[PDB]
Amino acid sequence: SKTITIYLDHASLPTLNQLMHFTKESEDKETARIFGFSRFKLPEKITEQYNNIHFVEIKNNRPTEDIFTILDQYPEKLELDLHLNIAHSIQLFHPILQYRFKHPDRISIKSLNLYDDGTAEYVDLEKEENKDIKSAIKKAEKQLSDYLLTGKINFDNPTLARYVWQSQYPVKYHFLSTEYFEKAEFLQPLKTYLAGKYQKMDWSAYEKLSPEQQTFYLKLVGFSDETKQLFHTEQTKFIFTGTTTWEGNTDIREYYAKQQLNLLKHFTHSEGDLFIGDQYKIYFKGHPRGGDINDYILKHAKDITNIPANISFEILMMTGLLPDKVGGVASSLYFSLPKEKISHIIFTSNKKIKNKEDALNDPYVRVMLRLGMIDKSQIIFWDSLKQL
């Protein structure tokens, strides 16, 4: 065979993980890699060293048909090591299945490494609490069998079906929150089913890395000396974290931008409801997909040190540059933080949230309550804050 390592993600969290996997094999310049993100994401000085590296667009949660043309370039017997996100694994897999129908003997699936996309997986699991999980796993296993035979996507429980890959392939899951699987009693049958097949997305796996490997990795993820020097001061530090919306609508985007700026003021102004105190130097860590919402903050915010938005927050934890306090909109990043470092986590909702009972039905709120990352007395949605 040749091994083809296929990394189908572009989103911040799974890609951060997959880039570490790549870094661990980076001295091997010959092995074929396919990445589901732009060729311009990584430094060209690095990528041009790899003689069998390709970049494919992910669209509607599937690699495009370019993936067929790439694989057509490899006439040998191939074993595919797939790396993909859990929430979208079914869709991401579809073209690989389609291609394998054409080359069933020559192309085999050697392994899957499955990673949380983010919090979507958790908020989706929250909606399954009253379902019969034992039988959902069974039904999904049968329905995965049919998907592999027919290529057609049909799952009674698309959320639980994300977790049955082991019935067909060697698999390892990388979870944002292993604790969630321990603390959610309704998931005990899944926890049991998955025993020994998962690990936490840990980020100490960056210490396992050699010193030169660590340097390489920072280059891949866009972390430089200049970023490091943003943290040179001894002064205690507060990072305001931003968020985003999958929504081109200008009114929705300008809404986000203005709400976010206002939220920042409630943390940084002595008149604010969340005032953190004068001791802290203030930083901004914009959402990587935040776009013009990030510009708006940088345009209008006084007295703030920007941490470039493309730098994933967790890189701060790996490199030992975490601040003293962090606050902002609910994000996957908070799952990485020790509790004492959290100032306030703030929520958003399309429904007007009018009171505490409305709040407790929000699935994101439920996840964070289940994990004890917030308590019920303090739950804040950002539209409840006054314009400052």
Ligand SMILES: Nc1ccn([C@@H]2O[C@H](COP(=O)(O)O)[C@@H](O)[C@H]2O)c(=O)n1
């Ligand atoms: N303000 C932010 C928000 C998200 N992120 C990155 O994007 C990932 C997904 O975050 P959300 O769940 O907020 O979309 C986080 O785990 C983090 O890697 C960031 O670096 N800075």
